[PDB]
Amino acid sequence: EDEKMILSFDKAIQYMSKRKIGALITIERHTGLDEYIETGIALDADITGELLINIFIPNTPLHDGAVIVKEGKIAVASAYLPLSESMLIPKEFGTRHRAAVGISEVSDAITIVVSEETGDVSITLDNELMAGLSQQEYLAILRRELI
Amino acid sequence: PQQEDEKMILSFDKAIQYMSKRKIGALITIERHTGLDEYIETGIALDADITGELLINIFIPNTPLHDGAVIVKEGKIAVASAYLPLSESMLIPKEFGTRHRAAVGISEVSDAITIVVSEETGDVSITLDNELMAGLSQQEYLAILRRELI
């Protein structure tokens, strides 16, 4: 039932992709994101699509940094992630994409970005940034990498 | 201690200040001795740490979470968008609003403390023991929350 979380992610992502609402969600796997989690605002909150949409409503106190998911919970919102210095990044991509890449360099975390500019959905994992994702594409990557 | 109870109050105050100034409607019910589980089961489970920032994000108008009541239970936002009973008091006009009737409603049926910000005015009210304290100062609502939550 790690699927319930994936369908909650799916609700949130569909809503924000269509409306070009920027979103940054890192999911902890084996590498502890402890030192990054303690830079954010504590939520320790149950995962629902509704909560994820509300966090990322633009011009709100929680929309800016990273949501970090750990166990079954939203641990924090507005967490600071390491920003990638990689010169291999296509530059059309913003701070959310540099956060996504930068946390993938130091961990095995899986990060979802919704572009604030285009509503383009991205997953980052193992330095690989996978932009331009459709619904069935992001749902399969997430299911594959989280069961 | 009171150190964490003072932190809860500081979270409410930040939320109240932000929404009052923007005329953002808000309803926050704080469980004390009366169980509110029958009302909590009607909402969307958050089970979240209390922060001013989360409370602001919850109540942004026309958002999934902004409607109904946040219920706080044992230092946790248990739910958003929860049902509370509407007061049917002979003392209350039709021209009172939904959140104000809910606030009066829950204070008739529980020792809960309810904060409401008027979406029409930004006026801050607290209901407690069948009593509605209307158009509160920051200093007033701080003093009421300090005396009842601590």
Author numbering:
A (entry chain AAA): 145 to 291
B (entry chain BBB): 142 to 291
Manuscript text:
The enzyme CdaA, which synthesizes an essential second messenger cyclic di-AMP (c-di-AMP) in many pathogenic bacteria, has emerged as a promising candidate for the development of novel antibiotics. Additionally, c-di-AMP regulates the bacterial stringent response, further underscoring its significance. The synthesis of c-di-AMP is mediated by enzymes possessing a diadenylate-cyclase (DAC) domain.
However, suitable crystallization conditions for unliganded LmCdaA could not be identified. Therefore, structurally related CdaA enzymes from S. pneumoniae, B. subtilis and E. faecium were cloned, overexpressed in E. coli, purified, crystallized and evaluated for diffraction quality. Additionally, we report the first crystal structures of apo CdaA from E. faecium (EfCdaA) and S. pneumoniae (SpCdaA), as well as atomic resolution structures of BsCdaA.
